[PDB]
From Swiss-Prot:
Disulfide bonds: none annotated. Can use both ATP and GTP as phosphoryl donors. Phosphorylation by casein kinase 2 has been estimated to represent up to one quarter of the eukaryotic phosphoproteome. Casein kinase 2 has been found to be increased at protein level and up-regulated at the level of enzyme activity in the majority of cancers. However, elevated levels of casein kinase 2 are present in certain normal organs such as brain and testes. Heterotetramer composed of two catalytic subunits (alpha chain and/or alpha' chain) and two regulatory subunits (beta chains). The tetramer can exist as a combination of 2 alpha/2 beta, 2 alpha'/2 beta or 1 alpha/1 alpha'/2 beta subunits. Also part of a CK2-SPT16-SSRP1 complex composed of SSRP1, SUPT16H, CSNK2A1, CSNK2A2 and CSNK2B, which forms following UV irradiation. Interacts with RNPS1. Interacts with SNAI1. Interacts with PML (isoform PML-12). Interacts with CCAR2. Interacts with HIRIP3. Phosphorylation does not directly affect casein kinase 2 activity, but may contribute to its regulation by forming binding sites for interacting proteins and/or targeting it to different compartments. Catalytic subunit of a constitutively active serine/threonine-protein kinase complex that phosphorylates a large number of substrates containing acidic residues C-terminal to the phosphorylated serine or threonine. Regulates numerous cellular processes, such as cell cycle progression, apoptosis and transcription, as well as viral infection. May act as a regulatory node which integrates and coordinates numerous signals leading to an appropriate cellular response. Residues 35-40 are annotated as: Interaction with beta subunit. The chain holds residues 2 to 328 of 391 of the full protein. It is an enzyme of class 2 (transferase). This is Casein kinase II subunit alpha. Constitutively active protein kinase whose activity is not directly affected by phosphorylation. Seems to be regulated by level of expression and localization. GO terms for cellular component: cytosol; nucleoplasm; nucleus; plasma membrane; PML body; protein kinase CK2 complex; Sin3-type complex. One of its GO terms (molecular function) is ATP binding. Expressed in gastric carcinoma tissue and the expression gradually increases with the progression of the carcinoma (at protein level). The active site is at 155 (proton acceptor).
Length: 327
């Protein structure tokens, strides 16, 4: 009765063999320092639960990014902070440099290392075959590291990957939707951003894992090597799954759904239709041939699969023939 259970193939019991203080973020005590050390310079934007500023560390004058939290659930704040502190110093993980409060207004804020980013709609067109393989390997390091530390990012997308192209420096950012992996846990599927949602999220399969980040990465990789942003462009969560099925086909979807005994919402049977599995070559053309290779396509193919257990892990990925020219 109910969905078939599932476990992560890798780093399954990493939180289980650690003490509660590592993953029990609700018992985390947060110390808020003084924000006077930083001077707001420019509104960058208005992230989901925050406003974000370029700031300046008055003391050393080094550049910084300040995320001023809207009033959010104390619980989520502690999660993000605890996750950031556990992953700090890890490869290509953004550094939580400080946690502070404005003395007068009391609004909490997280302060991060600054990356001199090129917007991904300017950057991605510039990128060569070598570039894409390099930066994908940098992302993979961040995801292997963070999966090994018991954590799923759950919001992998071009917006959360900061690239200083001059310095070939990449940072995986915004850990606000990240969560700790506990095998057996039935999680909230209202995560990631639409275009990067894995089919497990869309069919409401809750016992998901690190392999969610591997789907999202694939979506990014497809958009990059094919020059089509976003790759899967759905008008909502239901239609998102239709956009995937028009590429991966309907037969492997229904076989995935039956295998896990997933109860498909009735909205799907009207819209899903019947679609064959398309070859990845169908997407290759004169303007992107130079970024595609047999290896690129094989790597992509082993990321973008319905069955999350069958996707490459981030370690398996880093060993793929696609990365040989970089490693
Ligand atoms: C800070 C965070 O966790 N999320 C977040 C949310 C919105 C953000 C940013 C980060 C950055 C952002 C920008 C840069 N750099 C660009 C040159 C200014 N850097 N660099 C490091 C981080 C971090 N963390 C960072 N975050 C810009 N925006 C505005 C996006 C929008 O409104 O569309
Ligand atoms: Cl959540």
């Amino acid at each position: 009765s109910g969905p078939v259970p599932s476990r992560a193939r890798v780093y399954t019991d990493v939180n289980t063999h650690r003490p509660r203080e590592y993953w029990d973020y609700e018992s985390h005590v947060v110390e808020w320092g003084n924000q006077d050390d930083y001077q707001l310079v420019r509104k960058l934007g208005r992230g989901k639960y925050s406003e974000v500023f370029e700031a300046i560390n008055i003391t050393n004058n080094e550049k910084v990014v300040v995320k001023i939290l809207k009033p959010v659930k104390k619980k989520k704040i502690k999660r993000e902070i605890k996750i950031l502190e556990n992953l700090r110093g890890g490869p290509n993980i953004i550094t939580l440099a400080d946690i502070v409060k404005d003395p007068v207004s009391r609004t909490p804020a997280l302060v991060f290392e600054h990356v001199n980013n090129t917007d991904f709609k300017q950057l991605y067109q510039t990128l060569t075959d070598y570039d894409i393989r390099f930066y994908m390997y940098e992302i993979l390091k961040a995801l292997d590291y963070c999966h090994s530390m018991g954590i799923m990012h759950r919001d992998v997308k071009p917006h959360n990957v900061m690239i200083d192209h001059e310095h070939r420096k990449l940072r995986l950012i915004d850990w606000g939707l990240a969560e700790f992996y506990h095998p057996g846990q039935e999680y909230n599927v209202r995560v990631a951003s639409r275009y990067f949602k894995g089919p497990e999220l869309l069919v409401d399969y809750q016992m998901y894992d690190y392999s969610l980040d591997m789907w999202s990465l694939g979506c990014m990789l497809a958009s990059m090597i094919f020059r089509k942003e976003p790759f899967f462009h759905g008008h909502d969560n239901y239609d998102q799954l239709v956009r995937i099925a028009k590429v991966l086909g309907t037969e492997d979807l229904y076989d995935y759904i039956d295998k896990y005994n997933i109860e498909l919402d009735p909205r799907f049977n009207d819209i899903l239709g019947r679609h064959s599995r398309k070859r990845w070559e169908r997407f290759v053309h004169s303007e992107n041939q130079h970024l595609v290779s047999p290896e690129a396509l094989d790597f992509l193919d082993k990321l973008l699969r319905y069955d999350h257990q069958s996707r490459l892990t981030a370690r398996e990925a880093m060993e793929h023939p696609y990365f040989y020219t970089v490693v």
